[PDB]
Design an enzyme around this catalytic site. Structure first.
Site, PDB file in Angstrom:
ATOM      1  N   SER A   1       0.804  -1.245   0.000  1.00 31.87           N
ATOM      2  CA  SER A   1       0.000   0.000   0.000  1.00 31.87           C
ATOM      3  C   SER A   1       0.816   1.264   0.000  1.00 31.87           C
ATOM      4  O   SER A   1       0.232   2.355  -0.036  1.00 31.87           O
ATOM      5  CB  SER A   1      -0.923   0.068   1.195  1.00 31.87           C
ATOM      6  OG  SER A   1      -1.965  -0.894   1.023  1.00 31.87           O
TER       7      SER A   1
ATOM      8  N   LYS B   1       3.356   6.572   4.946  1.00 33.66           N
ATOM      9  CA  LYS B   1       2.337   5.633   4.432  1.00 33.66           C
ATOM     10  C   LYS B   1       2.874   4.216   4.563  1.00 33.66           C
ATOM     11  O   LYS B   1       3.978   3.925   4.045  1.00 33.66           O
ATOM     12  CB  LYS B   1       1.994   5.897   2.958  1.00 33.66           C
ATOM     13  CG  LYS B   1       0.994   4.889   2.375  1.00 33.66           C
ATOM     14  CD  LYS B   1      -0.436   5.140   2.948  1.00 33.66           C
ATOM     15  CE  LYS B   1      -1.388   3.927   2.679  1.00 33.66           C
ATOM     16  NZ  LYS B   1      -1.213   2.903   3.728  1.00 33.66           N
ATOM     17  N   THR B   2       2.108   3.334   5.190  1.00 32.35           N
ATOM     18  CA  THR B   2       2.497   1.958   5.418  1.00 32.35           C
ATOM     19  C   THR B   2       2.073   1.069   4.260  1.00 32.35           C
ATOM     20  O   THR B   2       1.228   1.431   3.427  1.00 32.35           O
ATOM     21  CB  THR B   2       1.859   1.416   6.691  1.00 32.35           C
ATOM     22  OG1 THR B   2       0.439   1.584   6.572  1.00 32.35           O
ATOM     23  CG2 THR B   2       2.318   2.206   7.890  1.00 32.35           C
ATOM     24  N   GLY B   3       2.712  -0.090   4.174  1.00 30.34           N
ATOM     25  CA  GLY B   3       2.193  -1.160   3.325  1.00 30.34           C
ATOM     26  C   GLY B   3       2.409  -2.506   3.969  1.00 30.34           C
ATOM     27  O   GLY B   3       3.468  -2.698   4.581  1.00 30.34           O
TER      28      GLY B   3
END
Length: 268
Positions: free
Chosen positions: A49, A213-215
Protein backbone atom coordinates in the site's frame (compact mmCIF):
# COMPACT_ATOMS: atom_id res chain seq x y z
CA UNK A 1 26.10 14.01 11.38
CA UNK A 2 29.22 12.33 10.07
CA UNK A 3 30.44 9.91 7.44
CA UNK A 4 31.67 7.56 10.17
CA UNK A 5 28.19 7.51 11.77
CA UNK A 6 26.56 6.80 8.41
CA UNK A 7 28.94 3.95 7.60
CA UNK A 8 28.40 2.52 11.08
CA UNK A 9 24.62 2.79 10.58
CA UNK A 10 24.84 0.80 7.35
CA UNK A 11 26.67 -1.95 9.26
CA UNK A 12 23.92 -1.90 11.88
CA UNK A 13 21.35 -2.39 9.09
CA UNK A 14 23.23 -5.50 7.93
CA UNK A 15 23.21 -6.80 11.50
CA UNK A 16 19.48 -6.09 11.84
CA UNK A 17 18.78 -8.03 8.65
CA UNK A 18 20.81 -10.94 10.06
CA UNK A 19 18.21 -11.29 12.82
CA UNK A 20 15.26 -12.29 10.62
CA UNK A 21 14.45 -14.64 7.75
CA UNK A 22 14.00 -12.03 5.04
CA UNK A 23 15.43 -8.95 3.45
CA UNK A 24 15.60 -5.28 4.31
CA UNK A 25 15.51 -2.48 1.74
CA UNK A 26 16.28 0.85 3.33
CA UNK A 27 17.10 4.40 2.33
CA UNK A 28 17.18 7.39 4.67
CA UNK A 29 18.23 10.80 3.29
CA UNK A 30 19.25 13.81 5.35
CA UNK A 31 18.04 16.61 3.10
CA UNK A 32 20.41 19.10 4.78
CA UNK A 33 23.19 17.51 2.69
CA UNK A 34 21.83 14.57 0.76
CA UNK A 35 23.73 12.20 3.06
CA UNK A 36 22.39 8.65 2.74
CA UNK A 37 22.09 5.57 4.93
CA UNK A 38 21.07 2.59 2.81
CA UNK A 39 20.76 -1.15 2.52
CA UNK A 40 19.75 -3.02 -0.69
CA UNK A 41 18.88 0.40 -2.14
CA UNK A 42 18.67 -0.82 -5.75
CA UNK A 43 16.82 -4.09 -5.27
CA UNK A 44 13.16 -4.30 -6.21
CA UNK A 45 10.58 -4.85 -3.44
CA UNK A 46 6.79 -5.24 -3.58
CA UNK A 47 5.53 -1.85 -2.44
CA UNK A 48 2.03 -2.96 -1.29
CA UNK A 49 0.00 0.00 0.00
CA UNK A 50 2.90 2.44 0.02
CA UNK A 51 1.92 3.18 -3.62
CA UNK A 52 -1.10 5.08 -2.26
CA UNK A 53 1.21 8.10 -1.80
CA UNK A 54 2.09 8.07 -5.53
CA UNK A 55 -1.65 7.56 -6.35
CA UNK A 56 -2.74 10.49 -4.20
CA UNK A 57 -0.07 12.69 -5.66
CA UNK A 58 -1.30 11.88 -9.16
CA UNK A 59 -4.84 12.80 -8.10
CA UNK A 60 -3.60 16.12 -6.66
CA UNK A 61 -1.74 16.83 -9.86
CA UNK A 62 -4.91 16.26 -11.86
CA UNK A 63 -6.85 18.52 -9.47
CA UNK A 64 -4.43 21.36 -10.08
CA UNK A 65 -5.95 21.51 -13.59
CA UNK A 66 -9.60 20.85 -12.64
CA UNK A 67 -11.33 23.02 -10.05
CA UNK A 68 -14.32 20.59 -9.72
CA UNK A 69 -12.30 17.44 -9.11
CA UNK A 70 -11.57 17.35 -5.38
CA UNK A 71 -15.24 17.81 -4.55
CA UNK A 72 -16.53 15.38 -7.15
CA UNK A 73 -18.38 12.67 -5.23
CA UNK A 74 -17.98 9.20 -6.74
CA UNK A 75 -20.88 6.80 -6.00
CA UNK A 76 -20.38 3.08 -5.47
CA UNK A 77 -22.50 0.19 -4.10
CA UNK A 78 -21.92 -2.50 -1.44
CA UNK A 79 -21.00 -4.99 -4.14
CA UNK A 80 -18.25 -2.64 -5.38
CA UNK A 81 -16.34 -2.76 -2.08
CA UNK A 82 -13.11 -4.64 -2.05
CA UNK A 83 -11.54 -6.10 1.04
CA UNK A 84 -10.20 -3.78 3.71
CA UNK A 85 -12.42 -0.71 3.22
CA UNK A 86 -12.93 0.65 6.75
CA UNK A 87 -13.92 4.14 5.61
CA UNK A 88 -15.65 3.63 2.27
CA UNK A 89 -17.87 0.83 3.62
CA UNK A 90 -19.59 3.57 5.72
CA UNK A 91 -20.61 5.64 2.69
CA UNK A 92 -22.00 3.21 0.17
CA UNK A 93 -24.60 4.69 -2.17
CA UNK A 94 -23.68 8.30 -2.83
CA UNK A 95 -20.04 7.62 -1.92
CA UNK A 96 -17.35 10.12 -0.98
CA UNK A 97 -15.60 13.12 -2.53
CA UNK A 98 -12.28 12.61 -4.31
CA UNK A 99 -10.52 14.53 -1.48
CA UNK A 100 -12.18 12.29 1.08
CA UNK A 101 -11.11 9.18 -0.91
CA UNK A 102 -7.50 10.40 -0.92
CA UNK A 103 -7.62 10.94 2.84
CA UNK A 104 -9.21 7.53 3.42
CA UNK A 105 -6.69 5.70 1.32
CA UNK A 106 -3.74 7.47 2.86
CA UNK A 107 -4.88 7.48 6.49
CA UNK A 108 -6.66 4.13 6.79
CA UNK A 109 -5.17 2.38 3.72
CA UNK A 110 -8.77 1.99 2.37
CA UNK A 111 -8.69 -0.28 -0.70
CA UNK A 112 -12.00 0.64 -2.33
CA UNK A 113 -10.87 4.26 -2.12
CA UNK A 114 -7.61 3.34 -3.84
CA UNK A 115 -9.42 1.40 -6.61
CA UNK A 116 -11.87 4.26 -7.22
CA UNK A 117 -8.97 6.69 -7.60
CA UNK A 118 -6.98 4.33 -9.88
CA UNK A 119 -10.08 4.04 -12.07
CA UNK A 120 -10.58 7.83 -12.02
CA UNK A 121 -7.06 8.36 -13.35
CA UNK A 122 -7.48 5.81 -16.15
CA UNK A 123 -6.06 2.64 -14.57
CA UNK A 124 -2.76 1.50 -13.06
CA UNK A 125 -0.77 2.67 -16.06
CA UNK A 126 -1.79 6.29 -15.31
CA UNK A 127 -0.16 6.00 -11.87
CA UNK A 128 3.04 4.65 -13.49
CA UNK A 129 2.94 7.50 -16.01
CA UNK A 130 2.60 9.99 -13.19
CA UNK A 131 5.66 8.44 -11.50
CA UNK A 132 7.60 8.84 -14.74
CA UNK A 133 6.52 12.46 -14.91
CA UNK A 134 8.21 13.21 -11.54
CA UNK A 135 11.45 11.48 -12.53
CA UNK A 136 10.75 7.96 -11.25
CA UNK A 137 11.85 5.53 -13.95
CA UNK A 138 11.58 2.53 -11.59
CA UNK A 139 8.12 2.52 -9.99
CA UNK A 140 5.49 0.37 -11.72
CA UNK A 141 1.83 -0.12 -10.82
CA UNK A 142 0.37 -3.12 -12.65
CA UNK A 143 -2.61 -4.32 -10.65
CA UNK A 144 -5.32 -2.92 -8.38
CA UNK A 145 -6.15 -3.66 -4.75
CA UNK A 146 -5.97 -6.30 -3.46
CA UNK A 147 -4.05 -8.37 -6.02
CA UNK A 148 -1.01 -6.05 -5.93
CA UNK A 149 -0.16 -7.45 -2.44
CA UNK A 150 0.84 -10.94 -3.54
CA UNK A 151 4.53 -9.97 -3.16
CA UNK A 152 5.79 -13.05 -4.98
CA UNK A 153 9.59 -13.40 -5.04
CA UNK A 154 10.98 -12.64 -8.51
CA UNK A 155 7.74 -11.00 -9.73
CA UNK A 156 8.43 -7.44 -10.83
CA UNK A 157 4.74 -6.34 -10.95
CA UNK A 158 3.86 -3.62 -8.41
CA UNK A 159 7.48 -3.06 -7.30
CA UNK A 160 10.00 -0.26 -6.89
CA UNK A 161 13.42 0.14 -5.29
CA UNK A 162 14.14 1.88 -2.01
CA UNK A 163 16.33 4.48 -3.81
CA UNK A 164 13.70 5.29 -6.41
CA UNK A 165 10.93 5.60 -3.84
CA UNK A 166 13.07 7.77 -1.50
CA UNK A 167 13.79 10.20 -4.39
CA UNK A 168 10.07 10.30 -5.23
CA UNK A 169 9.02 10.84 -1.60
CA UNK A 170 11.59 13.63 -1.35
CA UNK A 171 10.43 15.33 -4.53
CA UNK A 172 6.75 15.03 -3.55
CA UNK A 173 6.80 15.92 0.16
CA UNK A 174 9.91 18.18 0.42
CA UNK A 175 10.64 19.33 -3.15
CA UNK A 176 8.83 20.76 -6.09
CA UNK A 177 7.18 17.85 -7.86
CA UNK A 178 3.80 19.27 -6.69
CA UNK A 179 2.81 22.91 -6.42
CA UNK A 180 3.24 24.48 -2.99
CA UNK A 181 -0.41 24.00 -2.01
CA UNK A 182 -0.74 20.39 -3.28
CA UNK A 183 2.43 19.45 -1.41
CA UNK A 184 0.96 20.87 1.75
CA UNK A 185 -2.22 18.87 1.29
CA UNK A 186 -0.37 15.59 0.64
CA UNK A 187 1.82 16.19 3.72
CA UNK A 188 -1.21 16.93 5.89
CA UNK A 189 -2.97 13.78 4.80
CA UNK A 190 0.07 11.62 5.49
CA UNK A 191 0.78 13.34 8.85
CA UNK A 192 -2.70 12.26 9.84
CA UNK A 193 -2.06 8.61 9.03
CA UNK A 194 -3.60 6.16 11.56
CA UNK A 195 -1.78 2.97 10.49
CA UNK A 196 1.89 3.81 11.11
CA UNK A 197 2.34 4.16 14.85
CA UNK A 198 4.47 1.05 15.22
CA UNK A 199 6.74 1.61 12.17
CA UNK A 200 8.89 4.73 11.32
CA UNK A 201 7.06 6.74 14.00
CA UNK A 202 8.18 4.30 16.71
CA UNK A 203 11.84 4.89 15.78
CA UNK A 204 12.05 8.68 16.02
CA UNK A 205 12.03 11.19 18.91
CA UNK A 206 8.80 12.70 20.23
CA UNK A 207 9.23 16.06 18.51
CA UNK A 208 9.70 14.71 15.02
CA UNK A 209 6.53 14.77 12.98
CA UNK A 210 6.23 11.96 10.44
CA UNK A 211 4.30 12.05 7.22
CA UNK A 212 4.21 8.33 6.33
CA UNK A 213 2.34 5.63 4.43
CA UNK A 214 2.50 1.96 5.42
CA UNK A 215 2.19 -1.16 3.33
CA UNK A 216 1.61 -4.79 4.33
CA UNK A 217 1.30 -7.87 2.12
CA UNK A 218 1.95 -11.55 1.69
CA UNK A 219 5.42 -13.01 2.37
CA UNK A 220 5.30 -10.94 5.59
CA UNK A 221 5.89 -7.80 3.56
CA UNK A 222 6.06 -4.78 5.89
CA UNK A 223 6.78 -1.35 4.51
CA UNK A 224 6.69 2.31 5.54
CA UNK A 225 7.75 5.39 3.57
CA UNK A 226 7.71 9.07 4.35
CA UNK A 227 9.39 12.15 5.77
CA UNK A 228 10.24 13.03 9.34
CA UNK A 229 10.34 16.69 10.23
CA UNK A 230 12.55 17.49 13.22
CA UNK A 231 11.66 20.86 14.68
CA UNK A 232 14.99 22.64 14.00
CA UNK A 233 16.78 20.58 11.33
CA UNK A 234 16.12 19.75 7.66
CA UNK A 235 13.59 16.96 6.91
CA UNK A 236 14.77 13.37 6.72
CA UNK A 237 13.35 10.97 4.13
CA UNK A 238 12.71 7.35 5.27
CA UNK A 239 11.97 4.41 3.05
CA UNK A 240 11.70 0.99 4.65
CA UNK A 241 10.77 -2.14 2.66
CA UNK A 242 10.93 -5.62 4.22
CA UNK A 243 9.81 -8.97 2.90
CA UNK A 244 10.30 -12.51 4.13
CA UNK A 245 11.27 -15.88 2.75
CA UNK A 246 8.08 -17.64 3.84
CA UNK A 247 4.79 -16.83 2.11
CA UNK A 248 3.02 -17.32 5.44
CA UNK A 249 5.28 -14.97 7.47
CA UNK A 250 4.01 -12.06 9.58
CA UNK A 251 5.18 -8.55 8.92
CA UNK A 252 7.71 -7.17 11.43
CA UNK A 253 6.80 -3.73 12.82
CA UNK A 254 9.67 -4.03 15.28
CA UNK A 255 12.24 -4.50 12.49
CA UNK A 256 10.85 -1.51 10.56
CA UNK A 257 10.95 0.70 13.63
CA UNK A 258 14.50 -0.49 14.46
CA UNK A 259 15.71 0.31 10.93
CA UNK A 260 14.27 3.81 11.19
CA UNK A 261 15.76 4.28 14.65
CA UNK A 262 19.24 3.35 13.34
CA UNK A 263 19.14 6.18 10.79
CA UNK A 264 17.36 8.69 13.04
CA UNK A 265 20.02 8.34 15.67
CA UNK A 266 22.85 8.45 13.08
CA UNK A 267 21.61 11.71 11.53
CA UNK A 268 20.96 13.32 15.03
Amino acid sequence: GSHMRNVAAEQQLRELESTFDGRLGFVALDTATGARIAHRADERFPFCSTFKTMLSAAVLARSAGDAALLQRRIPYAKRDLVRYSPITEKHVGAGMTVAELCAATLQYSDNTAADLLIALLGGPQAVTAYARSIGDATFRLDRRETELNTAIPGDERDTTTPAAMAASVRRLLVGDALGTAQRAQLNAWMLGNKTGDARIRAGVPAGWRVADKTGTGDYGTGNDIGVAYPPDRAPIVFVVYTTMRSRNAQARDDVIASAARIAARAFV
